RNA sequence: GAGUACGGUAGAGGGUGGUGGAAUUUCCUGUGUAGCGGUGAAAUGCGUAGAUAUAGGAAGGAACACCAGUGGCGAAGGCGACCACCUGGACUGAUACUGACACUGAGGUGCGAAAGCGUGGGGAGCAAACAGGAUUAGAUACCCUGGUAGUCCACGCCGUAAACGAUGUCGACUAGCCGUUGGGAUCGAUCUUAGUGGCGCAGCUAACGCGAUAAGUCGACCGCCUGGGGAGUACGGC
């Protein structure tokens, strides 16, 4: 995740573009994940719950 | 890949491989590119194998 | 006390969940000036705010004008607040920001992190 | 015998006698009944990261038809040679013989 | 019904070696100067014997980001970096082949998470026990700073788990609709096959609910239950 300031634009679009690039990369999510240790039981449980919610989200569209 | 040919995704075709990496340098999820599961697995193995030979970067930073 | 000039510095913002540390160096990684939120006199809950980071960046930039440094590149690293207020303080110090890069270190598997707090 | 595909990249300082290494390897593996099907050279490319603090290397590709003995001896040559840097051996089932990527750009 | 021979597919199935990149830790060196770290707030702790930060280099160990998915493989336990070698099974199609060669299975034999144990290596991170700081009426806890067995490897033992779908194995029938994994045929659609999911008619159930992956309708064999404690304990055997 990196940007540049090119062709004399204010330092208010470059900063926001950098923020968007960092959000797209997924930096804060990765750091928050490695903040503490998640045991495999908890990881598998989270994946199962997210899958259930994703399927319900898809089905409710129709 | 089902269009005309290519019985597999090779690690020597950098032009095709670069279409399935983000600007960071990570493999693109199949739900975005719309690629089949079998072909997505072939992408993953080819990308890792070419990333070994320094043809593709592990990370944008290095 | 002896003088040395230097142009085109690099400013490293090191932001954690508790503090922020801003360090201006040359291209070779030789630190000229630095500042911190705790050094600005905040010392506590106030230390984890973008205002403290902005003040720290202001102090560091004012220190760094001594050598010149018409230009700074920026390296942000860390998830904490003060991540962006430091940069917008640095430009207002008067430098010409060529680019910003995020250099947060991410393990691929790495060591296991500490156990979870039961709060 | 058995098909193999070897990708092999040489240190840029020695990237002038690579013909010699190719020739000696080919002879050493085809003197035991082996066979060469494709031998491509697209050397002097730029690395995506620094291996042994260099940023250039001389790439080369060869498809061989060899046995266990030739495999082991060639692997030893690559192992104890100092101008080898990196290596990859990729056994497959078909003899591929008609270009891989060459220099498509002008 | 059950097996064999022949092409062909997908896979974190198993074992033995080799090698990668990110990150942490320690150590050496340059710049540089008063803080750093942590918390609900702190304090312990680390710093002017030059810390944290930053740049270059070296050593070592363990886990394998993205791909990653109601995805896959395995009898179960379980199995995610890449390559070579050794090796088991499943799926799929046509032709040929044997001719009931089958199912279940008390004893018995084998595999079996993690913790633990024995002998010998290894030691980055994490962290029982332990020490200190807080909090508290007290706090042998939660919280913070440290930290040893252990976690890793080889061989041997242990033989237990909410070892769970709380649902034994095998075979045959009984409306449908919507996804997905491996693979065939017909003209993107249709059909078909072995898995993996969400609903749902009959039927079943005390009810919740199950509903072709039955807890419906049947057949073959096996294991087990008989009010709550005492107790999965005592004694005896192995
Ligand atoms: Mg912590
Ligand atoms: Mg340092
Ligand atoms: Mg028995
Ligand atoms: Mg164990
Ligand atoms: Mg033990
Ligand atoms: Mg003990
Ligand atoms: Mg020991
Ligand atoms: Mg510790
Ligand atoms: Mg032990
Ligand atoms: Mg039991
Ligand atoms: Mg279990
Ligand atoms: Mg039971
Ligand atoms: Mg049943
Ligand atoms: Mg049945
Ligand atoms: Mg239902
Ligand atoms: Mg019942
Ligand atoms: Mg009784
Ligand atoms: Mg007993
Ligand atoms: Mg017991
Ligand atoms: Mg007894």
XYZ file of C-alpha atoms (C1' of nucleotides) and ligand atoms in Angstrom:
607
model
C 0.000 0.000 0.000
C 1.616 3.207 -1.241
C 0.721 6.378 -3.137
C 2.373 9.474 -4.592
C 1.563 13.157 -5.020
C 1.556 13.823 -8.765
C 0.614 16.953 -10.759
C 0.147 19.552 -8.031
C -2.966 18.451 -6.169
C -3.854 19.466 -2.599
C -2.777 17.335 0.324
C -6.414 16.391 0.881
C -6.986 13.909 -1.963
C -3.616 12.179 -1.711
C -4.201 11.418 1.968
C -7.719 10.123 1.329
C -6.487 8.055 -1.612
C -3.812 6.571 0.647
C -6.471 5.735 3.233
C -8.582 3.997 0.595
C -5.579 2.032 -0.664
C -4.701 0.893 2.861
C -8.305 -0.152 3.527
C -8.332 -2.114 0.275
C -5.072 -3.843 1.219
C -6.399 -4.969 4.605
C -3.756 -3.792 7.069
C -5.785 -2.982 10.180
C -7.771 -6.205 9.827
C -4.541 -8.267 9.678
C -3.089 -6.488 12.743
C -6.309 -6.835 14.741
C -6.331 -10.543 13.884
C -2.751 -11.134 15.110
C -3.421 -9.029 18.219
C -4.067 -12.178 20.299
C -4.157 -15.941 19.819
C -7.348 -17.553 18.516
C -7.511 -21.267 19.251
C -8.588 -23.503 16.348
C -11.941 -24.284 17.992
C -12.812 -20.582 18.028
C -11.590 -20.081 14.451
C -13.701 -22.960 13.153
C -16.726 -21.765 15.126
C -16.369 -18.267 13.663
C -16.093 -19.633 10.130
C -19.221 -21.742 10.637
C -21.226 -18.813 12.003
C -20.075 -16.496 9.215
C -21.009 -19.109 6.609
C -24.480 -19.509 8.116
C -25.013 -15.742 8.112
C -23.682 -15.427 4.551
C -26.076 -18.130 3.350
C -29.027 -16.508 5.124
C -28.025 -13.156 3.610
C -27.980 -14.704 0.135
C -31.292 -16.539 0.562
C -33.213 -13.590 2.005
C -32.592 -11.658 -1.234
C -35.344 -13.767 -2.833
C -9.558 -20.351 -19.572
C -12.475 -22.324 -20.969
C -12.716 -19.916 -23.927
C -10.241 -21.387 -26.423
C -7.499 -23.541 -24.908
C -4.820 -23.863 -22.210
C -5.217 -27.277 -20.566
C -3.758 -25.668 -17.425
C -2.352 -22.423 -16.076
C 1.423 -22.484 -16.464
C 3.962 -20.721 -14.271
C 5.828 -19.371 -17.313
C 2.983 -17.137 -18.552
C 3.538 -13.998 -16.505
C 0.998 -12.054 -18.576
C -1.875 -14.260 -17.406
C -0.567 -14.595 -13.846
C -0.302 -10.824 -13.374
C -4.049 -10.589 -14.033
C -4.704 -12.537 -10.808
C -2.625 -10.556 -8.318
C -3.482 -7.313 -6.581
C -1.136 -4.331 -6.563
C 0.008 -5.530 -3.146
C 0.912 -8.875 -4.719
C -1.659 -11.245 -3.229
C -3.786 -13.832 -4.998
C -7.226 -12.516 -5.928
C -10.194 -14.397 -4.404
C -12.248 -16.506 -6.787
C -15.478 -14.737 -5.810
C -14.187 -11.544 -7.459
C -12.623 -12.918 -10.651
C -15.429 -15.424 -11.230
C -12.952 -18.220 -11.947
C -13.946 -21.857 -11.505
C -12.726 -23.721 -8.433
C -10.472 -26.118 -10.351
C -8.879 -23.300 -12.313
C -8.516 -21.217 -9.143
C -6.534 -24.056 -7.563
C -4.328 -24.182 -10.658
C -3.829 -20.407 -10.397
C -2.787 -20.745 -6.770
C -0.224 -23.464 -7.428
C 1.221 -21.702 -10.490
C 1.444 -18.357 -8.689
C 3.271 -19.866 -5.712
C 5.606 -21.812 -7.995
C 6.472 -18.732 -10.069
C 6.808 -16.671 -6.895
C 9.561 -19.109 -5.914
C 11.652 -18.326 -9.019
C 11.511 -14.558 -8.314
C 9.334 -13.955 -11.376
C 6.575 -12.588 -9.124
C 7.091 -10.793 -5.798
C 5.869 -12.238 -2.525
C 5.005 -8.734 -1.322
C 5.044 -5.268 -2.844
C 7.410 -4.135 -0.090
C 10.504 -6.392 0.073
C 26.996 21.920 17.876
C 28.693 21.471 14.511
C 26.582 22.048 11.412
C 25.529 19.564 8.747
C 23.019 20.118 5.951
C 20.706 17.468 4.529
C 17.851 17.529 2.013
C 15.095 15.015 1.218
C 14.436 13.362 4.561
C 12.244 10.402 5.475
C 9.768 10.631 8.359
C 8.746 7.430 10.128
C 5.487 7.444 12.085
C 5.363 4.526 14.542
C 1.800 4.336 15.865
C 0.709 1.838 18.499
C -2.403 1.511 20.624
C -0.673 3.469 23.410
C 1.673 6.002 21.803
C 3.140 7.453 18.627
C 6.797 8.094 17.771
C 7.858 10.322 14.862
C 11.466 10.106 13.662
C 12.976 12.106 10.783
C 16.094 10.644 9.152
C 18.122 10.983 5.966
C 18.084 8.416 3.141
C 20.558 6.221 5.017
C 18.414 5.919 8.138
C 20.386 8.351 10.312
C 17.990 9.975 12.763
C 18.218 13.758 13.050
C 15.191 14.567 15.216
C 12.443 12.651 16.982
C 9.402 13.271 19.163
C 6.766 11.286 21.013
C 3.287 11.756 22.452
C 4.504 11.136 25.995
C 7.345 13.597 25.530
C 4.844 16.303 24.599
C 3.406 16.101 28.111
C 0.185 14.108 27.832
C 0.927 11.017 29.912
C -2.043 8.679 30.022
C -5.392 8.359 28.271
C -4.522 11.614 26.506
C -1.468 9.853 25.037
C -3.609 7.671 22.721
C -5.255 10.478 20.740
C -4.616 12.049 17.323
C -4.102 15.437 19.006
C -1.037 14.130 20.848
C 0.324 12.688 17.603
C -0.244 15.983 15.797
C 1.649 17.892 18.486
C 4.477 15.344 18.414
C 4.790 15.684 14.640
C 4.789 19.475 14.963
C 7.668 19.379 17.447
C 9.660 16.914 15.353
C 9.202 18.963 12.196
C 10.208 22.209 13.879
C 13.333 20.476 15.156
C 14.075 19.127 11.675
C 13.865 22.500 9.898
C 17.347 23.220 11.311
C 19.104 21.036 8.740
C 16.966 22.158 5.819
C 14.935 19.150 4.631
C 12.771 20.788 2.012
C 11.306 17.352 1.206
C 10.016 14.397 3.235
C 8.881 10.957 2.236
C 6.595 9.256 4.765
C 6.535 5.741 6.272
C 3.482 4.957 8.413
C 3.583 1.828 10.570
C 1.022 0.613 13.084
C -2.703 0.367 13.740
C -3.161 2.980 16.430
C -4.548 6.490 16.284
C -2.282 9.284 15.219
C -1.813 7.371 11.980
C -3.004 10.195 9.706
C -2.968 13.303 11.917
C 0.821 13.001 12.093
C 1.124 13.293 8.302
C -1.192 16.295 8.054
C 0.791 17.892 10.856
C 4.025 17.225 8.981
C 2.888 18.952 5.797
C 1.723 21.980 7.809
C 5.222 22.136 9.258
C 6.043 23.199 5.685
C 7.609 20.153 4.014
C 6.800 18.781 0.562
C 5.464 15.245 0.964
C 6.507 13.245 -2.099
C 4.789 9.994 -1.111
C 3.318 7.976 1.750
C 3.971 4.272 2.263
C 2.592 1.825 4.821
C 5.271 -0.512 6.162
C 3.329 -2.348 8.861
C 5.009 -5.738 9.476
C 2.711 -8.711 8.870
C 3.770 -12.293 9.666
C 2.813 -15.031 7.258
C 2.574 -17.560 10.025
C 5.099 -16.335 12.575
C 5.185 -16.810 16.310
C 1.993 -17.343 18.223
C 0.676 -14.197 19.912
C -0.193 -13.895 23.613
C -3.307 -15.380 25.148
C -6.572 -13.470 25.108
C -7.431 -11.145 27.975
C -10.505 -12.166 29.973
C -12.097 -8.780 30.556
C 12.803 -43.283 -18.853
C 11.151 -40.391 -17.038
C 10.295 -36.824 -18.041
C 11.553 -33.814 -16.115
C 11.532 -30.001 -16.512
C 14.412 -28.046 -14.867
C 14.531 -24.245 -14.385
C 17.949 -22.999 -13.380
C 19.319 -19.488 -12.867
C 22.996 -18.566 -12.699
C 24.842 -15.758 -10.947
C 25.224 -12.716 -13.239
C 29.019 -12.605 -12.842
C 29.345 -16.090 -14.334
C 26.619 -15.322 -16.879
C 29.052 -15.776 -19.765
C 30.131 -19.448 -19.526
C 26.580 -20.775 -19.073
C 26.951 -22.490 -22.439
C 29.685 -24.642 -20.948
C 27.551 -25.775 -18.026
C 24.628 -26.518 -20.324
C 26.838 -28.586 -22.620
C 28.503 -30.598 -19.857
C 25.167 -31.306 -18.155
C 23.562 -32.363 -21.433
C 26.453 -34.684 -22.260
C 26.524 -36.152 -18.757
C 22.826 -36.954 -18.869
C 22.607 -38.205 -22.467
C 25.643 -40.462 -22.042
C 23.556 -42.733 -19.780
C 20.717 -43.091 -22.283
C 19.117 -39.745 -21.493
C 17.592 -37.312 -23.929
C 17.097 -33.570 -24.407
C 13.791 -32.317 -25.784
C 13.795 -28.555 -25.240
C 16.618 -26.209 -24.251
C 15.593 -22.570 -23.875
C 17.674 -19.612 -22.736
C 16.049 -16.308 -21.779
C 18.740 -15.136 -19.423
C 19.534 -11.830 -17.744
C 16.185 -10.906 -16.226
C 15.455 -8.739 -13.196
C 14.594 -10.364 -9.876
C 11.443 -9.545 -7.933
C 13.554 -9.699 -4.763
C 17.230 -9.907 -3.887
C 18.638 -13.432 -3.570
C 22.134 -13.449 -2.050
C 22.188 -9.646 -2.352
C 21.984 -9.624 -6.152
C 19.233 -8.328 -8.413
C 20.173 -10.037 -11.696
C 20.365 -13.655 -12.787
C 20.745 -15.697 -15.963
C 17.710 -17.946 -16.429
C 17.662 -21.166 -18.442
C 15.166 -23.988 -19.052
C 15.688 -27.590 -20.078
C 13.358 -30.562 -20.519
C 15.108 -33.893 -20.023
C 14.336 -37.608 -20.282
C 16.441 -39.207 -17.587
C 16.568 -41.811 -14.815
C 17.282 -41.827 -11.083
C 21.065 -41.838 -11.520
C 21.165 -38.864 -13.885
C 18.716 -37.004 -11.655
C 20.818 -37.529 -8.546
C 24.095 -36.545 -10.182
C 22.605 -33.430 -11.788
C 21.065 -32.437 -8.460
C 24.491 -32.810 -6.849
C 26.041 -30.605 -9.538
C 23.464 -27.922 -8.789
C 23.837 -28.398 -5.030
C 27.599 -27.998 -4.689
C 28.023 -25.424 -7.464
C 28.415 -21.816 -6.359
C 26.932 -20.208 -9.502
C 23.545 -21.872 -9.043
C 21.599 -19.595 -6.621
C 18.225 -21.268 -7.139
C 16.745 -24.353 -8.763
C 13.463 -26.040 -9.629
C 12.705 -29.581 -10.847
C 9.154 -30.353 -11.942
C 8.604 -33.940 -13.193
C 5.757 -34.277 -15.683
C 4.349 -36.858 -18.106
C 4.632 -35.284 -21.573
C 7.602 -34.057 -23.598
C 6.956 -30.366 -24.290
C 9.085 -29.115 -27.163
C 7.645 -25.969 -28.848
C 8.475 -22.635 -27.140
C 7.346 -21.377 -23.738
C 7.457 -17.567 -23.718
C 10.710 -16.541 -25.542
C 10.705 -12.738 -26.142
C 7.190 -11.882 -27.290
C 7.771 -8.154 -26.791
C 9.886 -6.331 -29.359
C -25.120 -58.716 -5.107
C -19.579 -58.932 -4.613
C -14.776 -58.881 -6.951
C -10.666 -58.719 -11.534
C -8.294 -56.727 -15.978
C -8.054 -51.607 -19.131
C -7.794 -45.768 -20.104
C -8.931 -41.414 -17.283
C -9.730 -37.773 -13.405
C -9.690 -34.671 -8.435
C -7.581 -34.435 -3.529
C -4.331 -30.237 3.500
C -4.675 -39.135 2.386
C 0.306 -41.328 4.598
C 5.854 -41.693 5.039
C 11.299 -40.007 3.905
C 14.590 -36.055 2.530
C 15.663 -31.066 0.449
C 14.583 -25.884 0.061
C 11.809 -20.905 0.515
C 9.590 -15.856 2.042
C 7.197 -12.759 5.851
C 7.686 -11.885 11.048
C 9.487 -12.244 16.187
C 13.974 -12.738 19.596
C 19.155 -12.310 20.734
C 23.919 -10.480 19.336
C 27.635 -6.687 16.610
C 27.928 -1.645 14.426
C 26.385 3.804 12.748
C 23.002 8.177 13.744
C 20.515 10.211 17.906
C 18.492 12.080 22.867
C 15.070 11.592 27.296
C 11.999 8.809 27.657
C 9.906 3.702 26.489
C 6.498 -0.133 27.897
C 1.889 -1.158 30.094
C -3.348 0.051 32.052
C -10.026 1.700 33.323
C -6.134 4.252 36.252
C -1.595 2.925 37.676
C 2.628 0.550 39.419
C 6.354 -3.261 38.880
C 9.881 -3.412 34.560
C 13.547 -1.223 30.749
C 16.620 3.670 30.027
C 21.566 8.843 30.156
C 26.786 2.429 31.913
C 22.854 5.845 26.079
C 17.020 2.933 26.078
C 12.560 2.826 22.708
C 13.140 4.650 17.349
C 15.962 4.119 12.871
C 19.763 1.636 9.082
C 23.314 -2.496 7.880
C 24.883 -7.483 9.187
C 24.871 -12.466 11.574
C 22.661 -16.875 14.477
C 18.673 -19.887 15.588
C 13.825 -22.021 16.265
C 8.596 -22.682 15.398
C 4.393 -21.740 12.318
C 2.980 -21.645 6.977
C -0.687 -14.570 5.349
C -3.362 -13.999 0.515
C -5.509 -18.490 -2.385
C -9.620 -20.315 1.615
C -14.838 -22.001 0.024
C -22.083 -25.145 3.883
C -14.512 -26.434 -0.191
C -11.562 -31.364 -0.369
C -9.279 -36.108 1.492
C -9.323 -40.076 5.461
C -12.531 -45.951 9.114
C -12.237 -42.625 12.986
C -8.557 -39.604 15.633
C -7.260 -36.028 11.942
C -4.654 -33.605 7.594
C -3.130 -26.469 4.904
C 4.503 -23.240 2.155
C 7.109 -25.529 -2.378
C 9.836 -29.706 -4.809
C 11.566 -34.897 -5.616
C 11.068 -40.082 -4.118
C 8.081 -44.387 -1.818
C 2.939 -45.585 -1.133
C -3.113 -46.513 0.177
C -7.937 -45.664 -1.335
C -12.134 -43.136 -3.855
C -14.578 -41.252 -8.455
C -15.406 -41.961 -13.783
C -16.308 -44.819 -19.108
C -16.501 -48.861 -22.584
C -15.693 -53.752 -23.366
C -14.425 -58.420 -21.449
C -13.925 -61.915 -17.070
C -15.336 -65.139 -12.232
C -19.896 -67.010 -10.973
C -23.092 -65.886 -4.578
C -17.099 -65.775 -3.993
C -22.138 -61.905 0.632
C -23.804 -58.896 5.348
C -23.065 -58.646 10.553
C -19.923 -60.073 14.180
C -19.445 -62.037 21.361
C -14.104 -63.298 22.225
C -9.599 -61.290 19.639
C -6.427 -57.966 17.124
C -4.913 -52.806 15.261
C -5.219 -47.497 14.969
C -6.608 -43.689 18.406
C -6.833 -35.417 20.036
C -4.563 -33.025 23.988
C -2.280 -33.509 28.555
C 1.178 -36.968 30.874
C 5.575 -40.519 31.346
C 10.995 -42.837 29.813
C 15.777 -42.152 27.179
C 18.559 -38.647 24.007
C 18.643 -33.663 21.225
C 16.788 -28.791 20.593
C 15.162 -23.520 23.013
C 12.613 -17.993 18.688
C 7.492 -17.181 20.493
C 3.826 -18.748 24.023
C 3.219 -20.304 28.783
C 1.001 -24.483 33.973
C 4.159 -23.958 38.573
C 6.776 -19.604 40.693
C 8.111 -14.155 41.809
C 6.799 -9.079 41.940
C 2.876 -4.774 40.955
C -2.164 -3.626 41.187
C -7.595 -4.462 42.538
C -10.117 -5.886 46.953
C -13.022 -6.305 53.297
C -9.667 -10.367 51.924
C -7.910 -12.068 46.343
C -3.717 -18.498 47.049
C -8.200 -15.134 40.918
C -9.465 -12.222 36.781
C -5.601 -7.480 35.050
C 0.086 -6.000 34.334
C 5.857 -7.150 34.122
C 8.755 -11.430 34.164
C 9.231 -16.687 33.866
C 10.692 -22.857 34.388
C 8.457 -27.810 32.917
C 5.801 -28.284 28.385
C 4.834 -26.973 23.441
C 9.327 -29.031 18.570
C 12.400 -33.839 16.912
C 13.669 -39.538 17.195
C 12.233 -44.157 19.532
C 9.046 -46.415 23.419
C 4.702 -46.223 26.687
C -0.166 -44.339 28.014
C -5.452 -45.656 25.748
C -8.670 -41.539 27.573
C -12.315 -36.636 25.505
C -19.112 -32.632 24.994
C -13.534 -39.092 20.976
C -20.816 -35.417 19.161
C -24.616 -35.779 13.980
C -25.111 -36.527 21.904
C -28.099 -40.595 15.972
C -24.105 -48.924 15.035
C -23.197 -51.393 10.259
C -25.487 -53.278 5.596
C -29.617 -53.448 1.718
C -34.464 -51.960 -0.600
C -38.654 -48.519 -1.390
C -41.393 -43.253 -0.512
C -43.906 -35.532 -3.534
C -40.853 -31.601 -4.765
C -37.720 -26.710 -5.000
C -32.893 -24.007 -4.481
C -27.090 -24.001 -4.148
C -22.183 -26.377 -4.453
C -17.540 -30.315 -5.280
C -15.361 -34.581 -8.785
C -17.116 -36.743 -13.598
C -19.735 -38.525 -17.755
C -23.969 -38.132 -21.989
C -28.118 -35.190 -25.276
C -29.523 -30.856 -27.890
C -25.782 -22.361 -22.781
C -30.110 -25.683 -21.291
C -31.619 -31.069 -20.265
C -30.423 -35.902 -18.350
C -27.529 -38.916 -15.247
C -23.769 -40.529 -11.140
C -20.881 -40.403 -6.102
C -20.494 -36.526 -2.341
C -21.742 -31.823 0.528
C -25.637 -27.922 2.218
C -30.777 -24.818 2.881
C -36.095 -25.353 2.791
C -40.381 -28.603 2.491
C -45.683 -32.619 1.084
C -46.961 -37.375 3.184
C -45.476 -40.132 7.411
C -43.328 -40.132 12.441
C -42.602 -37.644 17.437
C -44.294 -36.006 24.403
C -42.808 -31.838 22.166
C -38.777 -29.560 20.090
C -38.174 -31.361 15.615
C -36.671 -35.323 11.518
C -38.107 -35.338 6.620
C -33.836 -39.747 -0.120
C -27.241 -37.594 4.201
C -35.167 -40.021 7.931
C -35.767 -39.775 13.652
C -40.902 -42.515 7.374
C -42.038 -47.794 5.421
C -39.228 -52.778 5.967
C -35.380 -56.843 6.440
C -30.151 -59.223 8.709
C -26.754 -59.060 12.719
C -24.531 -56.627 16.982
C -23.933 -53.237 21.558
C -26.741 -51.264 25.569
C -31.141 -49.511 29.407
C -34.623 -50.750 33.696
C -36.198 -44.569 39.769
C -32.500 -40.497 42.192
C -28.188 -40.592 45.437
C -24.146 -44.005 47.566
C -21.080 -44.641 42.485
C -18.600 -45.742 37.487
C -17.102 -45.659 43.901
C -15.167 -50.112 47.316
C -13.055 -55.018 47.161
C -10.900 -58.868 43.698
C -8.704 -59.823 38.834
C -6.157 -58.085 34.364
Mg -0.413 -8.205 25.916
Mg 16.995 -1.182 17.543
Mg -15.234 -56.003 20.827
Mg 1.450 -34.542 22.621
Mg 5.273 -34.918 28.369
Mg 4.731 -34.518 36.260
Mg 14.174 -33.131 27.522
Mg 6.459 -12.903 28.824
Mg 9.328 -35.123 26.915
Mg -15.794 -42.934 27.283
Mg -13.740 -34.203 18.184
Mg -21.187 -41.854 23.507
Mg -30.603 -45.134 11.474
Mg -30.399 -46.745 3.347
Mg -36.001 -29.081 7.286
Mg -37.830 -41.299 19.523
Mg -29.824 -47.885 41.739
Mg -12.173 -47.080 39.376
Mg -12.621 -41.382 34.719
Mg -9.008 -52.083 40.844
